[PDB]
Design a protein around this ligand. Structure first.
Ligand SMILES: *[C@@H]1O[C@H](CO[C@H]2O[C@@H](C)[C@@H](O)[C@@H](O)[C@@H]2O)[C@@H](O[C@@H]2O[C@H](CO)[C@@H](O[C@@H]3O[C@H](CO)[C@@H](O)[C@H](O)[C@@H]3O)[C@H](O)[C@H]2NC(C)=O)[C@H](O)[C@H]1NC(C)=O
Ligand SMILES: *[C@@H]1O[C@H](CO[C@H]2O[C@@H](C)[C@@H](O)[C@@H](O)[C@@H]2O)[C@@H](O[C@@H]2O[C@H](CO)[C@@H](O[C@@H]3O[C@H](CO)[C@@H](O)[C@H](O)[C@@H]3O)[C@H](O)[C@H]2NC(C)=O)[C@H](O)[C@H]1NC(C)=O
Ligand SMILES: *[C@@H]1O[C@H](CO)[C@@H](O)[C@H](O)[C@H]1NC(C)=O
Ligand SMILES: *[C@@H]1O[C@H](CO)[C@@H](O)[C@H](O)[C@H]1NC(C)=O
Ligand code: NA
Lengths: 394, 394
């Protein structure tokens, strides 16, 4: 009954005869499955967690230049040389400056120069690759127990959590009391997982095109990196200025954080809490309910009368939910429940929460029925005090 | 002699007769002025400092969201309300979420919501407006004294520093020993100063178009601001997400520092040290040298012989510089110096450092002459030991 109250709720019914039903889940969605002489169940896909992707690459989006040093030579004295010219943490550039008496040389002319500054990354992205094979989809199955606090309760303490993997065959489900049901799940994500890379920025984390990712004009380190200093293309964030041949300067290009966001507009976002993300993927599964069995078809209809505990409420999908309490002595019994017509002649509606049964003189029961459009009557209980609440749909 | 050794060096000669000469300065440039029976002078424009512009506006390029709070209502209970909805430091957004039994309401339907988060700026730009009238151009005048350490010496301790302003009439120049010269300067900058705004980012500071500046999609405060909290358009850096009608989130758009740089590519850069900038502007001035007079035309040519102290060096502009020392007893006397021809008959070159004179038996003298293309002979001194150094130009 977890679905009762969710906007994006899909109702799925069993193939007339065959106790097999196909459903589709996706974060922000809910599915209420029904099947002849079978408990009504609610399925929701909690989380979709990639186990441990691989760091394809690692871009630096903000750096600091330090320990700047420079070497120069007089005209006709060959190129300058700096040891740092070989230190992978340093970024260097050769250039030329005017030289003459006024500044150390006996000759006037363009003299060679070379400047180096130590590049230290301050913040970095981290593109990653995920393989559908290793995607553990968690799914919570909440049966329409009718339990007092079940309606819309998203605690989890009402359904049975089930872990699933495409590379884990067909998984089984133990529904404490109803038996067992089995799910035949297959990946079937939105976009390809090879052409797409999982980019991450301390919190916001998208999913972009492999190529676009790699073409990013930013200092980077190959995934297999551990050093975290020998950045490739350090100059994509470093600029060398020598305007009047006097001196040469090295500058930082400042944080690219926002620029990345600004460029990840069309990209596919993906909320994620340090490892448990909430993707976008139609996770299809097949349901076998052969081992599933109604609860207590060994009980007898109740004879006593019921007291509406919580007034009939209509859901965003035309269904109605009502809560009632049993006052009869019957003890563990079934609740009479029909959606008759205006004259109590025929039947016009169906129970969504199939086979309603009281379990304790003092535990109210929640029932979700689906009345027709227009009028109908919700007839609950039997003759002595039979509630005959009227209703109008859509 | 400060110009000797500078690449961008312009030689300016006086209008045959009139002792008035027009020169143009700009950072990274140098001008060597000459005029019949007048000392040769070198002009360089040290700095161009705007006195105190006005903060047109102040954009925030990096912010932090804090103290998030939210109010919500059940279906058919009117809009939610937050006190912060009125606190100018807070950014808020109304929205809708599904509600029903499972989460507090007796009805199922879209319930109103409103979320607010306190916006705190962390880093900011600061566009500014400058008016030409108040631009104090500093200019250093270094005469061709011939002084031992003058060639290319950029210490300043050789020339006389002169402050100048368009709104300061015509300025006078006291050249200790040569008399006085006067400069008639007029603004004449590159671009207009109304259509352009002086943008600044902790060091890097450009000059962009007023409109483009103001159209920047960034939180901002009117220049006259002192508060520094009631930012306008805070949402240009704040995003509200409510994907599944469950909850609504507020997020920061992260630093725009680099994005601004990346967008200030075509813009006009402007190095600046906390107030003293180095602009781009052809500062034209007119020179009156009437009160200027050659030095020591009361001395007599030396008779002794000279010793080349620093070998003849050629500059990036065909001129040659030589340093010699006097060994004669003559004391304060003039140095004989001519650029004769291959046969010591006629004259082929001119002195740039006009009227060379020794001043101390032990103080070498620097002379810059301009020999012709091809051969010529630098004849220094007189008969007894007259140096006859030969030379080849270009
Ligand atoms: C969502 O579900 C949680 C937990 O579900 C269990 O609730 C119990 C009562 C039972 O129905 C079991 O089958 C469910 O799995 C609900 O949390 C429970 O809340 C109730 C009432 O708020 C608590 O019961 C007791 O009530 C008496 C009143 O006479 C008090 O004196 C007791 O101190 C106690 O509160 C119970 O302790 C809670 N148990 C847990 C696990 O938290 C929750 O109320 C429900 N909410 C929704 C969405 O309806
Ligand atoms: C650029 O100019 C500075 C200062 O200019 C003055 O230099 C003095 C010498 C004189 O010519 C005056 O008219 C100039 O305005 C030069 O700095 C000076 O350097 C000299 C030599 O390096 C120093 O002179 C002395 O030399 C004797 C050697 O016998 C030593 O024993 C003394 O200790 C002393 O060094 C003088 O002190 C310096 N003065 C100043 C103000 O620094 C500088 O060398 C020159 N450089 C270039 C670009 O050529
Ligand atoms: C960088 O410069 C600092 C400050 O002078 C010094 O302490 C440090 O040892 C230098 N480190 C490197 C890598 O050059
Ligand atoms: C913001 O929240 C902090 C942490 O609870 C609190 O100390 C502070 O007083 C709050 N300030 C504002 C402006 O709400
Ligand atoms: Na002749």
């Amino acid at each position: 009954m977890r679905c009762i109250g969710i906007s994006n709720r899909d109702f799925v019914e069993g193939v007339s005869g065959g106790s097999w039903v196909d459903i589709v889940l996706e974060h922000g969605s809910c599915v209420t499955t029904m099947a002849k002489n079978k408990p009504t169940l609610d399925f929701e896909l909690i989380k979709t967690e990639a186990k441990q992707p691989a760091t394809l690459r690692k871009y630096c989006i903000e750096a600091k230049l330090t320990n700047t040093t420079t070497e120069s030579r007089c005209p006709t004295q060959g190129e300058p040389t700096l040891n740092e010219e070989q230190d992978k943490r340093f970024v260097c550039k050769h250039s030329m400056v005017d030289r003459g008496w006024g500044n150390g040389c006996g000759l006037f002319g363009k003299g060679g120069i070379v400047t180096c500054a130590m590049f230290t990354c301050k913040k970095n992205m981290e593109g990653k690759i995920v393989q559908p094979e290793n995607l553990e989809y968690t799914v919570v199955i909440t049966p329409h127990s009718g339990e007092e606090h079940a309606v819309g309760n998203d605690t989890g303490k009402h359904g049975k959590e089930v872990k699933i993997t495409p590379q884990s065959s067909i998984t089984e489900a133990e529904l404490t009391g109803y038996g067992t049901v089995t799910m035949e799940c297959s990946p079937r994500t939105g976009l390809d997982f090879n052409e797409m890379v999982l980019l991450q920025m301390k919190d916001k984390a998208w999913l972009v095109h492999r190529q676009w990712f790699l073409d990013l004009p930013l200092p980077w380190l190959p995934g297999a990196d551990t050093q975290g200093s020998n950045w490739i293309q350090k100059e994509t964030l470093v600029t060398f200025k020598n305007p009047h041949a006097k001196k040469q300067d090295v500058v930082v290009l400042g944080s690219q954080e926002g620029a990345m966001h600004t460029a990840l507009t069309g990209a596919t976002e993906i909320q994620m809490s340090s490892g448990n993300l909430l993707f976008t993927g139609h996770l299809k599964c097949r349901l076998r309910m052969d081992k599933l069995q109604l609860k207590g078809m060994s009980y007898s209809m109740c004879t006593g009368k019921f007291k509406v505990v919580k007034e009939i409420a209509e859901t965003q999908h035309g269904t109605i939910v009502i809560r009632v309490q049993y006052e009869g002595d019957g003890s563990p019994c079934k609740i009479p429940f029909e959606i008759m017509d205006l004259e109590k002649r025929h039947v016009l509606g169906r129970l969504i929460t199939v086979n309603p049964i009281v379990t304790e003189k003092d535990s109210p029961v929640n029932i979700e029925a689906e009345p027709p459009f227009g009028d109908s009557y919700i007839i609950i209980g039997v003759e002595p005090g039979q509630l005959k609440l009227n209703w109008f749909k859509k």
